[PDB]
Design a protein around this nucleic acid. Structure first.
Ligand SMILES: [Mg+2]
Ligand SMILES: [Mg+2]
Ligand SMILES: [Mg+2]
Ligand SMILES: [Mg+2]
Ligand SMILES: [Mg+2]
Ligand SMILES: [Mg+2]
Ligand SMILES: [Mg+2]
Ligand SMILES: [Mg+2]
Ligand SMILES: [Mg+2]
Ligand SMILES: [Mg+2]
Ligand SMILES: [Mg+2]
Ligand SMILES: [Mg+2]
Ligand SMILES: [Mg+2]
Ligand SMILES: [Mg+2]
Ligand SMILES: [Mg+2]
Ligand SMILES: [Mg+2]
Ligand SMILES: [Mg+2]
Ligand SMILES: [Mg+2]
Ligand SMILES: [Mg+2]
Ligand SMILES: [Mg+2]
Ligand SMILES: [Mg+2]
Ligand SMILES: [Mg+2]
Ligand SMILES: [Mg+2]
Ligand SMILES: [Mg+2]
Ligand SMILES: [Mg+2]
Ligand SMILES: [Mg+2]
Ligand SMILES: [Mg+2]
Ligand SMILES: [Mg+2]
Ligand SMILES: [Mg+2]
Ligand SMILES: [Mg+2]
Ligand SMILES: [Mg+2]
Ligand SMILES: [Mg+2]
Ligand SMILES: [Mg+2]
Ligand SMILES: [Mg+2]
Ligand SMILES: [Mg+2]
Ligand SMILES: [Mg+2]
Ligand SMILES: [Mg+2]
Ligand SMILES: [Mg+2]
Ligand SMILES: [Mg+2]
Ligand SMILES: [Mg+2]
Ligand SMILES: [Mg+2]
Ligand SMILES: [Mg+2]
Ligand SMILES: [Mg+2]
Ligand SMILES: [Mg+2]
Ligand SMILES: [Mg+2]
Lengths: 106, 197, 157, 127
RNA sequence: UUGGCGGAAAGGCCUUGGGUGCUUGCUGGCGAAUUGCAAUGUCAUUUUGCGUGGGGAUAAAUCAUUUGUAUACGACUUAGA
RNA sequence: GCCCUGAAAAUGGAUGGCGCUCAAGCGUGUUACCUAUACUCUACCGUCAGGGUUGAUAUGAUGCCCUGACGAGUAGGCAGGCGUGGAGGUCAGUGACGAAGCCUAGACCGUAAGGUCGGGUCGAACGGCCUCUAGUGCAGAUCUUGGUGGUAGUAGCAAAUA
RNA sequence: GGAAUACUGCCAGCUGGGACUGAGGACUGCGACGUAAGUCAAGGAUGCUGGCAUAAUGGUUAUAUGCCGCCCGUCUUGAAA
RNA sequence: GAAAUUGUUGAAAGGGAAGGGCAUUUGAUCAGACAUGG
């Protein structure tokens, strides 16, 4: 097993926003391979996770996770909306994100 | 979906390649553009020479240093179109642009790396036929670019090597075919075929 | 005094709840989940392992088995919402699967000799049925993982 | 050791500092409503400070409760303390700042007895 | 380890001869649990300090002084074992 | 119709920018998509309105309770509150075993005016509640007095022979 | 000649996925399913299960990052001027 | 023995001002527990 991965690869594009006013409370996400609202429905409800590092080790681990879930589709092009427990950093715009298979309905 | 993405600048339309390249960066994609000299601009040469000259005549009146800078080489003619489509004065923007690299002719690392094209910025696919367009290198040399000749020299020299390379490779797969056959219609062959392979 | 005493003070009776009207109705599983269907566990200790569905316990969970000798996974509980039910399925007629229930798993460190035995009973039958079809055993041992350009949202399983 | 009570929701925890209290020293954070004819604040332009208004009113129930679950009651001495003799899951005691070290042991003691809560034990305490 | 090739930023590429770990091309014998139904479970590379032992090298610059091809002050340019 | 000519101004520059030529232009049609303090449902604050309720039944009848609607605001009106010096009354209120005061990217309460506490500093006084009373609340007035900055180790300290 | 189908509209037809909410706190109302005992989705969430302890969580503060924010006071039809 | 203003020490930030609003990362800091058998 060269591969170990059970998530689909995703990007963090943006907060929800108008031209000139943003909303940190929702986050727009680009899910690799997904190209349409139709498609992006599959991942609604699924669990997102932003995984980052830090100096001050907490749980024996210096790796931390921001969790949240995909909530609805966005636009016409497979892009999708997410709430996280705590809104994502914004320095994270263009960072990678992880979209999981649970809660599975397959 | 690729750590880095090399784009053969050739036959692309500046503004459209610029627009796609620029969104890629903002999304976290590392892009490196090669052969910027063989890049296109819609409209006939004279037009875009005229345009560049309008760009040229602007400069801080009291100190030409402060005022707008007029990069001449194709890579940077393109970087201008590109930067104009990024919020380049913000932290985010500065970061975006630091995921970009733009060369004329394709120069090491990438000499042996695979480049791609961007269909939705592919001049041939895009421009109506008969419509006049501009080659970026000719434009540049025309407004002061010093190095078209050299890039031409190095490019040819490289195309030489790359040929013997491809010719080797095109022949290796000859050898791979000679032994492909012996297994081509073996038993697992017909078996893999069952499942689409 | 430092502060004038309040004129009211509430009561310190704590009221009763209102007679709620929620009632535990049963939970029908999704149609992909039938006993003997191969499962892909998506979370937890055994993520990515392929595994055989057995029974649907009273606490909404799925009895699971592996089998153990096939890939280290025990007779175990797992939540239905964290599993990709696959298309493939092994017969489970000749497997007992009666004694297992909520209380069976109820934590009373050191594994009982019962559990270890029950495993062997259940497994020997499953591995019997598994081995019938070619590569089902080997499949069952290999772990699932998304390869490059897998699009789960229209892969089959 | 306190009553039920709904989730204490605060709904605007930040402070409400007077406009330009950060600009000039002479201007104190204590709120004051901007009166001026031009002011962006009085006019509520996007991007400025928020002003106190009644919509931030706290839930009438959870109002006045400290995190514990009790309205705190300022207590000067033991007679004052004993007003909280019944209402124990309701109130807790704040021992007055000016209460001598010695008497605080007495109030502390009596409250431990009565089961009344003290918001600030280890007041004037010798450790 | 044998040959080569690469200067556009070559700092990489092809090739020779063995050695050696693995090999899922194939057939066996074990192991996995109790991490208790998800959380929280591969650790990637930067620097920077110390630590072991192995190889290795054994300088100048500035201040001051001095020149006037220089100079408002710094700066410049010379000179001194 | 579109395009071309007619079409000349002063710092270098503006379909907002980049840039766009079967458009990213012009005319038209068809869908989808993005987004306001507006609309829909819900919580909570307040305001107004309409009711219910002390028959004897522990602690608020100006109170408790049920229901509906509504919320922009200068000049301005009114209401309800916050805070200060002094006065009557009361907590037989706090206090040299530490009053008041001052310090505190320490804590709590209130939408707020503010209130409360801890720690440090201090050293002789001082609060709460009902009421009375006013020389009662500052950012401004080229406001008054005082105190202090940047300017700045700066301008300069070069007439009158040495 | 006999059909389908599109388009439009209706069903007090069935059904899957996702999202936010869970105010109230004995009973009392209107009902529904039942041959009945009784049960119910019927005047507002319950059940089961797990996790947290020099911790989960939260308040404050500093900084960074995304978007946003001209100097108050004044006279004025109009002031960042 | 307040403030302006200042020296030292400590932490931090700083591509043509500073300061603010909503939001979260990161660091610092502060919480509310309540009690069960030996
Ligand atoms: Mg949006
Ligand atoms: Mg073009
Ligand atoms: Mg140009
Ligand atoms: Mg010029
Ligand atoms: Mg901007
Ligand atoms: Mg070359
Ligand atoms: Mg059901
Ligand atoms: Mg094995
Ligand atoms: Mg006005
Ligand atoms: Mg005393
Ligand atoms: Mg070995
Ligand atoms: Mg999870
Ligand atoms: Mg001289
Ligand atoms: Mg003319
Ligand atoms: Mg024009
Ligand atoms: Mg026109
Ligand atoms: Mg059009
Ligand atoms: Mg029209
Ligand atoms: Mg149109
Ligand atoms: Mg609103
Ligand atoms: Mg109003
Ligand atoms: Mg008053
Ligand atoms: Mg008062
Ligand atoms: Mg007074
Ligand atoms: Mg007076
Ligand atoms: Mg301070
Ligand atoms: Mg004192
Ligand atoms: Mg004295
Ligand atoms: Mg009065
Ligand atoms: Mg006066
Ligand atoms: Mg003043
Ligand atoms: Mg002033
Ligand atoms: Mg001096
Ligand atoms: Mg001087
Ligand atoms: Mg003079
Ligand atoms: Mg003289
Ligand atoms: Mg219908
Ligand atoms: Mg409730
Ligand atoms: Mg925290
Ligand atoms: Mg702005
Ligand atoms: Mg001001
Ligand atoms: Mg005028
Ligand atoms: Mg003004
Ligand atoms: Mg003194
Ligand atoms: Mg704690």
């Amino acid at each position: 097993a060269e591969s170990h991965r059970l998530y689909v690869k995703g990007k963090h594009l943006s907060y929800q926003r108008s031209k000139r006013v943003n909303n940190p409370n929702v986050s727009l996400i680009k899910i690799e391979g997904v190209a349409t609202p139709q498609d992006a429905q599959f991942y609604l409800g699924k669990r997102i996770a932003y995984v980052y590092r830090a100096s001050k080790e907490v749980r024996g681990s210096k790796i931390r996770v921001m969790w949240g879930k995909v909530t609805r589709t966005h636009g016409n092009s497979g892009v999708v909306r997410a709430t996280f427990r705590n809104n994502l950093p914004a320095k994270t715009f263009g960072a990678s994100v992880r979209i999981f298979l649970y809660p599975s309905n397959i | 979906v690729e750590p880095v993405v090399v784009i053969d600048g050739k036959g692309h339309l500046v503004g459209r390649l610029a627009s796609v390249v620029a969104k890629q960066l903002l999304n976290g994609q590392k892009i490196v553009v090669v052969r910027a000299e063989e890049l296109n601009i819609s409209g006939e040469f004279f037009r875009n020479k005229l345009k560049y000259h309008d760009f040229l005549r602007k400069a801080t009146a009291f100190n030409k240093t402060r005022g707008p800078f007029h990069f001449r080489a194709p890579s940077r003619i393109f970087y201008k179109a590109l930067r104009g489509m990024v919020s380049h004065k913000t932290a985010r923007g500065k970061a975006a642009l630091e995921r970009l690299k733009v060369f004329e002719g394709i120069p090491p690392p990438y000499d042996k790396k695979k480049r791609v094209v961007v269909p939705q910025a592919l001049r041939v696919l895009r421009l109506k036929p008969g419509r006049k367009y501009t080659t970026l290198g000719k434009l540049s040399t025309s407004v002061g670019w010093k190095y078209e000749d050299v890039v031409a020299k190095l490019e040819a020299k490289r195309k030489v090597s790359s040929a013997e390379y491809y010719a080797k490779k095109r022949a290796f797969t000859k050898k791979v075919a000679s032994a492909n056959a012996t297994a081509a219609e073996s038993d697992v062959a017909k078996q893999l075929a069952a499942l689409g392979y | 005094s430092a502060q004038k005493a309040p004129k009211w003070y509430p009561s310190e009776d704590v009221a009763a709840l209102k007679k709620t009207r929620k009632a535990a109705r049963p939970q029908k599983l999704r149609a992909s989940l039938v006993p003997g269907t191969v499962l892909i566990l998506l979370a937890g200790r055994f993520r990515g392992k392929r595994v055989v569905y057995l029974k649907h316990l009273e606490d909404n969970t799925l009895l699971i088995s592996g089998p153990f000798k096939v890939n280290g996974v025990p007779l175990r509980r797992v939540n239905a919402r964290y599993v990709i039910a696959t298309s493939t399925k092994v017969s489970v007629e000749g497997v007992n699967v009666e004694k297992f229930n909520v209380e069976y798993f109820a934590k009373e460190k050191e594994i009982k000799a019962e559990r270890v035995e029950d495993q062997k009973v259940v497994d020997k039958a499953l591995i019997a049925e598994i081995k019938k079809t070619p590569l089902l055993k080997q499949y069952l041992s290999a772990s699932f993982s998304l390869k490059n350009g897998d699009k789960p949202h229209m892969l089959k399983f | 050791a306190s009553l039920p009570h709904p989730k204490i929701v605060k709904k605007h925890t930040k402070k409400f500092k007077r406009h330009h209290s950060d600009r000039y020293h002479r201007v104190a954070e204590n709120w004051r409503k901007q009166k001026g004819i031009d002011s962006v604040v009085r006019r509520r332009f996007r991007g400025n400070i928020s002003q106190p208004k009644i919509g931030y009113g706290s839930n009438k129930k959870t109002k006045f409760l400290s995190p514990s679950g009790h309205k705190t009651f300022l207590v000067a001495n033991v007679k004052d303390l004993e007003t909280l003799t019944m209402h124990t899951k309701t109130y807790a005691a704040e021992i007055a700042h000016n209460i001598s070290a010695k008497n605080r042991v007495v109030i502390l003691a009596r409250a431990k007895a009565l089961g009344i809560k003290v918001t600030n034990p280890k007041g004037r305490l010798a450790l």
